[PDB]
mmCIF file of all heavy atoms in Angstrom:
data_model
loop_
_atom_site.group_PDB
_atom_site.id
_atom_site.type_symbol
_atom_site.label_atom_id
_atom_site.label_comp_id
_atom_site.label_asym_id
_atom_site.label_seq_id
_atom_site.Cartn_x
_atom_site.Cartn_y
_atom_site.Cartn_z
ATOM 1 N N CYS D 6 -5.076 12.890 3.312
ATOM 2 C CA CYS D 6 -6.403 13.491 3.528
ATOM 3 C C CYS D 6 -6.643 14.441 2.364
ATOM 4 O O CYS D 6 -5.711 15.160 1.923
ATOM 5 C CB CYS D 6 -6.486 14.333 4.820
ATOM 6 S SG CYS D 6 -6.370 13.287 6.278
ATOM 7 N N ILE D 16 -16.631 22.721 6.423
ATOM 8 C CA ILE D 16 -16.656 21.660 5.417
ATOM 9 C C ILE D 16 -18.035 21.145 4.983
ATOM 10 O O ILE D 16 -18.173 20.463 3.961
ATOM 11 C CB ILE D 16 -15.745 20.493 5.777
ATOM 12 C CG1 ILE D 16 -16.200 19.755 7.066
ATOM 13 C CG2 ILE D 16 -14.338 20.974 5.992
ATOM 14 C CD1 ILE D 16 -15.492 18.371 7.189
ATOM 15 N N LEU D 93 -10.876 3.915 11.959
ATOM 16 C CA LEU D 93 -9.773 4.163 11.027
ATOM 17 C C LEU D 93 -8.643 3.098 11.123
ATOM 18 O O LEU D 93 -8.163 2.586 10.101
ATOM 19 C CB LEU D 93 -9.242 5.589 11.192
ATOM 20 C CG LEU D 93 -8.153 5.925 10.178
ATOM 21 C CD1 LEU D 93 -8.629 5.918 8.762
ATOM 22 C CD2 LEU D 93 -7.491 7.252 10.555
ATOM 23 N N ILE D 114 -8.319 9.804 2.676
ATOM 24 C CA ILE D 114 -9.414 10.027 3.649
ATOM 25 C C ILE D 114 -10.184 11.236 3.098
ATOM 26 O O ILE D 114 -9.584 12.281 2.891
ATOM 27 C CB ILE D 114 -8.809 10.242 5.031
ATOM 28 C CG1 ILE D 114 -8.064 8.946 5.456
ATOM 29 C CG2 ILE D 114 -9.849 10.786 6.022
ATOM 30 C CD1 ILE D 114 -7.422 9.038 6.785
ATOM 31 N N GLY D 116 -13.189 12.482 4.444
ATOM 32 C CA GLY D 116 -13.926 13.183 5.571
ATOM 33 C C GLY D 116 -14.782 12.153 6.285
ATOM 34 O O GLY D 116 -14.831 11.016 5.840
ATOM 35 N N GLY D 117 -15.485 12.509 7.334
ATOM 36 C CA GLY D 117 -15.681 13.861 7.828
ATOM 37 C C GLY D 117 -14.783 14.277 8.923
ATOM 38 O O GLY D 117 -13.646 13.778 9.037
ATOM 39 N N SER D 118 -15.236 15.216 9.779
ATOM 40 C CA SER D 118 -14.327 15.874 10.755
ATOM 41 C C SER D 118 -13.588 14.924 11.634
ATOM 42 O O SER D 118 -12.371 15.023 11.753
ATOM 43 C CB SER D 118 -15.035 16.911 11.670
ATOM 44 O OG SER D 118 -15.906 17.660 10.907
ATOM 45 N N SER D 119 -14.308 13.925 12.179
ATOM 46 C CA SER D 119 -13.690 13.023 13.159
ATOM 47 C C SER D 119 -12.586 12.140 12.593
ATOM 48 O O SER D 119 -11.579 11.880 13.262
ATOM 49 C CB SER D 119 -14.748 12.219 13.920
ATOM 50 O OG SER D 119 -15.474 11.441 13.009
ATOM 51 N N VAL D 120 -12.808 11.678 11.364
ATOM 52 C CA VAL D 120 -11.890 10.863 10.572
ATOM 53 C C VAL D 120 -10.641 11.724 10.307
ATOM 54 O O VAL D 120 -9.505 11.304 10.512
ATOM 55 C CB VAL D 120 -12.531 10.467 9.206
ATOM 56 C CG1 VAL D 120 -11.708 9.380 8.571
ATOM 57 C CG2 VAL D 120 -14.014 10.009 9.360
ATOM 58 N N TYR D 121 -10.820 12.935 9.790
ATOM 59 C CA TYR D 121 -9.697 13.849 9.562
ATOM 60 C C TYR D 121 -8.912 14.076 10.826
ATOM 61 O O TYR D 121 -7.666 13.962 10.815
ATOM 62 C CB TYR D 121 -10.238 15.219 9.125
ATOM 63 C CG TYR D 121 -10.783 15.301 7.704
ATOM 64 C CD1 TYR D 121 -11.901 16.032 7.445
ATOM 65 C CD2 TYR D 121 -10.146 14.707 6.633
ATOM 66 C CE1 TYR D 121 -12.417 16.134 6.141
ATOM 67 C CE2 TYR D 121 -10.578 14.876 5.297
ATOM 68 C CZ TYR D 121 -11.751 15.557 5.056
ATOM 69 O OH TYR D 121 -12.248 15.762 3.801
ATOM 70 N N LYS D 122 -9.617 14.400 11.929
ATOM 71 C CA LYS D 122 -8.959 14.671 13.203
ATOM 72 C C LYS D 122 -8.013 13.524 13.647
ATOM 73 O O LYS D 122 -6.871 13.806 14.024
ATOM 74 C CB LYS D 122 -9.975 14.930 14.317
ATOM 75 C CG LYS D 122 -9.243 15.490 15.531
ATOM 76 C CD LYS D 122 -10.164 15.623 16.739
ATOM 77 C CE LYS D 122 -9.444 16.381 17.816
ATOM 78 N NZ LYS D 122 -8.938 17.647 17.209
ATOM 79 N N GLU D 123 -8.526 12.268 13.615
ATOM 80 C CA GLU D 123 -7.770 11.132 14.072
ATOM 81 C C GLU D 123 -6.579 10.920 13.157
ATOM 82 O O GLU D 123 -5.464 10.668 13.627
ATOM 83 C CB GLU D 123 -8.578 9.832 13.978
ATOM 84 C CG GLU D 123 -7.744 8.675 14.529
ATOM 85 C CD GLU D 123 -8.463 7.342 14.547
ATOM 86 O OE1 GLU D 123 -9.723 7.352 14.447
ATOM 87 O OE2 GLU D 123 -7.761 6.316 14.715
ATOM 88 N N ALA D 124 -6.789 11.040 11.867
ATOM 89 C CA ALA D 124 -5.655 10.829 10.941
ATOM 90 C C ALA D 124 -4.588 11.912 11.216
ATOM 91 O O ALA D 124 -3.404 11.612 11.224
ATOM 92 C CB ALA D 124 -6.109 10.875 9.497
ATOM 93 N N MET D 125 -5.021 13.164 11.336
ATOM 94 C CA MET D 125 -4.080 14.320 11.479
ATOM 95 C C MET D 125 -3.159 14.335 12.688
ATOM 96 O O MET D 125 -2.074 15.013 12.707
ATOM 97 C CB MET D 125 -4.805 15.662 11.319
ATOM 98 C CG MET D 125 -5.222 15.912 9.900
ATOM 99 S SD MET D 125 -6.552 17.083 9.740
ATOM 100 C CE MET D 125 -5.764 18.638 10.225
ATOM 101 N N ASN D 126 -3.577 13.578 13.705
ATOM 102 C CA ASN D 126 -2.977 13.591 15.038
ATOM 103 C C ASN D 126 -2.223 12.276 15.298
ATOM 104 O O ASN D 126 -1.716 12.038 16.383
ATOM 105 C CB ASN D 126 -4.111 13.749 16.080
ATOM 106 C CG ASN D 126 -4.760 15.153 16.101
ATOM 107 O OD1 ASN D 126 -4.749 15.912 15.132
ATOM 108 N ND2 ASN D 126 -5.412 15.465 17.241
ATOM 109 N N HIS D 127 -2.189 11.417 14.290
ATOM 110 C CA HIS D 127 -1.644 10.090 14.433
ATOM 111 C C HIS D 127 -0.251 10.207 13.932
ATOM 112 O O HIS D 127 -0.027 10.845 12.912
ATOM 113 C CB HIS D 127 -2.416 9.133 13.559
ATOM 114 C CG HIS D 127 -2.067 7.702 13.804
ATOM 115 N ND1 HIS D 127 -0.990 7.113 13.235
ATOM 116 C CD2 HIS D 127 -2.681 6.737 14.602
ATOM 117 C CE1 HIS D 127 -0.920 5.823 13.642
ATOM 118 N NE2 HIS D 127 -1.954 5.589 14.474
ATOM 119 N N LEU D 131 2.031 11.783 6.382
ATOM 120 C CA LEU D 131 0.658 12.136 5.970
ATOM 121 C C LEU D 131 0.744 13.420 5.165
ATOM 122 O O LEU D 131 1.469 14.417 5.543
ATOM 123 C CB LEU D 131 -0.275 12.321 7.203
ATOM 124 C CG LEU D 131 -1.780 12.668 6.924
ATOM 125 C CD1 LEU D 131 -2.410 11.436 6.268
ATOM 126 C CD2 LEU D 131 -2.438 13.043 8.246
ATOM 127 N N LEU D 133 -1.925 16.451 3.500
ATOM 128 C CA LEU D 133 -3.241 16.982 3.393
ATOM 129 C C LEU D 133 -3.352 17.762 2.104
ATOM 130 O O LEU D 133 -2.540 18.714 1.842
ATOM 131 C CB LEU D 133 -3.404 18.005 4.500
ATOM 132 C CG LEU D 133 -3.525 17.588 5.945
ATOM 133 C CD1 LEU D 133 -3.726 16.109 6.399
ATOM 134 C CD2 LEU D 133 -3.205 18.671 6.993
ATOM 135 N N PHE D 147 -16.728 21.239 10.704
ATOM 136 C CA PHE D 147 -15.483 22.018 10.497
ATOM 137 C C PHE D 147 -14.280 21.088 10.359
ATOM 138 O O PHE D 147 -14.238 20.002 10.957
ATOM 139 C CB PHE D 147 -15.337 22.991 11.698
ATOM 140 C CG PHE D 147 -16.458 23.986 11.748
ATOM 141 C CD1 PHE D 147 -17.725 23.649 12.356
ATOM 142 C CD2 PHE D 147 -16.318 25.232 11.150
ATOM 143 C CE1 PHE D 147 -18.812 24.527 12.331
ATOM 144 C CE2 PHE D 147 -17.423 26.114 11.151
ATOM 145 C CZ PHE D 147 -18.658 25.769 11.731
ATOM 146 N N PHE D 148 -13.294 21.576 9.596
ATOM 147 C CA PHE D 148 -12.000 20.902 9.502
ATOM 148 C C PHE D 148 -11.175 21.117 10.753
ATOM 149 O O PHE D 148 -11.121 22.248 11.334
ATOM 150 C CB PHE D 148 -11.239 21.432 8.297
ATOM 151 C CG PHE D 148 -10.081 20.525 7.887
ATOM 152 C CD1 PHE D 148 -10.351 19.231 7.403
ATOM 153 C CD2 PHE D 148 -8.736 20.941 7.911
ATOM 154 C CE1 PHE D 148 -9.350 18.353 6.951
ATOM 155 C CE2 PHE D 148 -7.734 20.081 7.505
ATOM 156 C CZ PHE D 148 -8.022 18.751 7.051
ATOM 157 N N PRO D 149 -10.527 20.070 11.229
ATOM 158 C CA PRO D 149 -9.721 20.312 12.422
ATOM 159 C C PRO D 149 -8.545 21.242 12.189
ATOM 160 O O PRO D 149 -8.144 21.477 11.041
ATOM 161 C CB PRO D 149 -9.206 18.912 12.822
ATOM 162 C CG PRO D 149 -9.784 17.925 11.857
ATOM 163 C CD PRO D 149 -10.583 18.648 10.802
ATOM 164 N N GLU D 150 -7.990 21.781 13.302
ATOM 165 C CA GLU D 150 -6.760 22.616 13.249
ATOM 166 C C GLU D 150 -5.637 21.915 12.521
ATOM 167 O O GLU D 150 -5.359 20.734 12.799
ATOM 168 C CB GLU D 150 -6.317 23.021 14.668
ATOM 169 C CG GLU D 150 -5.001 23.786 14.655
ATOM 170 C CD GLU D 150 -4.617 24.378 16.015
ATOM 171 O OE1 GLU D 150 -5.223 24.011 17.052
ATOM 172 O OE2 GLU D 150 -3.703 25.212 16.010
ATOM 173 N N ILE D 151 -5.048 22.607 11.544
ATOM 174 C CA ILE D 151 -3.722 22.260 11.054
ATOM 175 C C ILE D 151 -2.568 22.894 11.846
ATOM 176 O O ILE D 151 -2.335 24.105 11.805
ATOM 177 C CB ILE D 151 -3.562 22.641 9.541
ATOM 178 C CG1 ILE D 151 -4.727 22.039 8.739
ATOM 179 C CG2 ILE D 151 -2.181 22.301 9.046
ATOM 180 C CD1 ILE D 151 -4.701 22.492 7.301
ATOM 181 N N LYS D 155 4.022 21.067 12.551
ATOM 182 C CA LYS D 155 4.338 19.782 11.983
ATOM 183 C C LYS D 155 3.985 19.700 10.516
ATOM 184 O O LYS D 155 4.692 19.038 9.804
ATOM 185 C CB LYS D 155 3.806 18.604 12.807
ATOM 186 C CG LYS D 155 2.339 18.456 12.840
ATOM 187 C CD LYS D 155 1.918 17.479 13.931
ATOM 188 C CE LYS D 155 0.422 17.233 13.737
ATOM 189 N NZ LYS D 155 -0.089 16.086 14.546
ATOM 190 N N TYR D 156 2.915 20.378 10.092
ATOM 191 C CA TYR D 156 2.482 20.327 8.651
ATOM 192 C C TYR D 156 3.060 21.461 7.779
ATOM 193 O O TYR D 156 2.660 22.632 7.938
ATOM 194 C CB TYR D 156 0.987 20.460 8.522
ATOM 195 C CG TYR D 156 0.285 19.179 8.952
ATOM 196 C CD1 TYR D 156 -0.214 19.055 10.217
ATOM 197 C CD2 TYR D 156 0.145 18.122 8.049
ATOM 198 C CE1 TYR D 156 -0.834 17.879 10.619
ATOM 199 C CE2 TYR D 156 -0.457 16.949 8.420
ATOM 200 C CZ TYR D 156 -0.986 16.873 9.716
ATOM 201 O OH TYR D 156 -1.544 15.649 10.129
#
Side-chain angles (χ1 to χ4, degrees):
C6 292
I16 64 165
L93 183 64
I114 296 179
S118 317
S119 61
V120 193
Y121 286 141
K122 192 186 189 53
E123 183 178 342
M125 289 158 69
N126 289 24
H127 189 278
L131 182 67
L133 288 350
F147 296 83
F148 197 65
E150 175 172 13
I151 308 174
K155 68 194 189 168
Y156 286 96

